[PDB]
Design a protein around this ligand. Sequence first.
Ligand SMILES: C[C+](CO)[C@H](O)COP(=O)(O)OP(=O)(O)O
Ligand SMILES: C[C+](CO)[C@H](O)COP(=O)(O)OP(=O)(O)O
Ligand code: SF4
Ligand code: SF4
Lengths: 402, 402
Amino acid sequence: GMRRPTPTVYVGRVPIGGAHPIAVQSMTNTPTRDVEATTAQVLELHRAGSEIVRLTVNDEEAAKAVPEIKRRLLAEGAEVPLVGDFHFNGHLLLRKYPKMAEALDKFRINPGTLGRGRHKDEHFAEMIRIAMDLGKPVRIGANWGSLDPALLTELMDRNARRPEPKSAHEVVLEALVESAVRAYEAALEMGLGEDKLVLSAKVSKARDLVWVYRELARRTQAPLHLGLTEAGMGVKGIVASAAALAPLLLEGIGDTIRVSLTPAPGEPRTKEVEVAQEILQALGLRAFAPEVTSCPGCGRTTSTFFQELAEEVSRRLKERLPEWRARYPGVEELKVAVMGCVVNGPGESKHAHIGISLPGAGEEPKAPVYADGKLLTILKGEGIAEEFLRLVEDYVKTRFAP
Amino acid sequence: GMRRPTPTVYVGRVPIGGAHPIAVQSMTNTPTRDVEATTAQVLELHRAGSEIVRLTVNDEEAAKAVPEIKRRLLAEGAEVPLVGDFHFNGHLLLRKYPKMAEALDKFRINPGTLGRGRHKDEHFAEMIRIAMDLGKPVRIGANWGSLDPALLTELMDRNARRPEPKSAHEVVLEALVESAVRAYEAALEMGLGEDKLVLSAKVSKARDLVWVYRELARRTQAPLHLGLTEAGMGVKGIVASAAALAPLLLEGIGDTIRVSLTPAPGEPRTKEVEVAQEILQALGLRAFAPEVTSCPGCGRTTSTFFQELAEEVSRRLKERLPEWRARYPGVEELKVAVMGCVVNGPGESKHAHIGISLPGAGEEPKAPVYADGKLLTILKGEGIAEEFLRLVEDYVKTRFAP
Ligand SMILES: C[C+](CO)[C@H](O)COP(=O)(O)OP(=O)(O)O
Ligand SMILES: C[C+](CO)[C@H](O)COP(=O)(O)OP(=O)(O)O
Ligand code: SF4
Ligand code: SF4
């Protein structure tokens, strides 16, 4: 499909923009002052597949901790770029702690959390000046939870002058886009390079996000950071995130993504990285790991045996991945089918790299295996699972041989 | 947004089509012969919100059980329409067991599982004849796991004659659409009403599904049953389902949906109904239950307290829903915010019906609550959670009073 062309912005060693794979990022939830906790969580997130990690730089204690966090990450060869999240006092922290400024790989600015009235433009310029001095890229990140009140008022008035005014909600979305686009144009006029600017403008409802990002994509040339903000907890958060991003990503809009889930108490922060990966992979945009295609099962197959086989295949693939990723470049693209009966079993299996079709009700007790679209063997008896996994291993060795 | 206009097809008492809410359906996985197990699961699915329930009618024993299943459902006032899923021997079962034919509310036919060569058209006509006799609606449901081989061959040849032939994969998608569209046109020519025909053409990859359904929507006037077939297990299944459907639903394509997840061993079959609901609600197309908007939390808030509050609010809303749904019509639209700090807390809360913003790091220990966009109160001390839930209850009573 189409991918929107953009200049390349390097965030540390990671390039983002239309010429590069869409990058997965995340954000810590440890207090940034706590150097031990924050370093450990940055590493955890990076190991799960966060190519870029953001951390809040909220107060002086946080700022003073950043250089030590960066130092520890580098000591273990962990080249993970760090993004500093600034609100209200970004200009003061970057001025007062130049070592923190230099240790970050990117600054995030929010045009609605710069200061009130006259403070705004001066605080903005000071942060942009510092980024230009140190050669750092910046994300200008608008969020409708912190929308600039004076800009909203300006656009509400323009709207009230229209022959047919739009709803309050539509004007809020207009204002959000305008906040980002105006600050983008200001930073460029100040001399920040096109290769140093990423944009976002996040809302918490899927259909609104699609409208906003279509506007941003039309009105600017910058790489876009895409996310549904405040997506929430559990299945609701996951579904909403996937639903909001998909229409945009299929249209070629978006260069980096973050999934904004509320973790359940005791649930790992890495869940959001796993979801981000699954969105990109489901849309054919990146490949992170082999995936199992399996039917829901119905009354045509025995539910327990089928469900346990599919689960067993999935678990084994996950167990082998670290090894396979090292020996068999390209293996991330592998598609394995596990199907419940003859209705769609063979056909789906033939569309996979390798697939097995169980015998359902009414059929003789044997399971055909297909690979590269043709019959490979027919399994029977116990250890169907072990025999199929051995076939998958052998197929991987042969196809993804260096 | 846009909704594609279509005639209305009644599936039992449930209308589907462009004038009606998008209907959620599911499918049993019990052996249909087992009357007790199947009835119980139909009820379970319906209670979770499956407006229509499909069951496989695969052999003579299944067919003989359907009338008794329908009888038991009606005895408890459970008006849930049943869809019969037929493959290979549909024509024989419908002819041989007219009581089963009459007990179903809809027949599903697959144009790739009718029989080979010459059998196809005669088996198709016999099933359509029976549906016309009994006034039953039919879904003509194509699936790329069971694609008609002779049609594929026909389209592969047409493709090989093109000045620039398309890939094998693109021709498969062409053939899938063609299978559904041709059978649609055949059924109409036989005299089945436009008010009796629903179409589907499912594939297991998201970007392919979007292409297919855009073609179906253009080429036919029928209500469309939308689903990503064989979506698989766990988070992968959920994400893929949401990602595939969203672009279509936002464009106004789709009149009923089914989510095709593989259950984990021991996991309830109702999970797919919950996911379907969440997709529709995330896109603003239906409202099933109040939803909590919450931030991911970062280093600006204390992670445990915030995460436990958000979880507590969610659990309480879920506890009250059966009652609230009965007393407060419209309450399904309720949006509650639970936010971690002052950065986006107030703003997001003001966009909700009612929201609370916790104090983060550096702030005085108090939590503003907003309702209908303005400050309602400020909470402090212990029992913030209980006090906020009491405010949510009071807000619901006042706004959603009959
Ligand atoms: C981190 C904080 C600052 O706006 C937000 O509340 C949550 O993060 P998010 O959903 O990734 O949204 P942002 O890109 O930070 O605007
Ligand atoms: C039930 C069976 C018949 O094609 C499939 O394997 C799975 O169900 P599904 O994903 O809902 O797809 P269908 O609408 O049944 O084609
Ligand atoms: S492949 Fe067979 S068992 Fe699986 S859902 Fe389809 S028809 Fe049912
Ligand atoms: S609202 Fe505050 S605590 Fe929550 S994610 Fe945003 S900045 Fe962090």
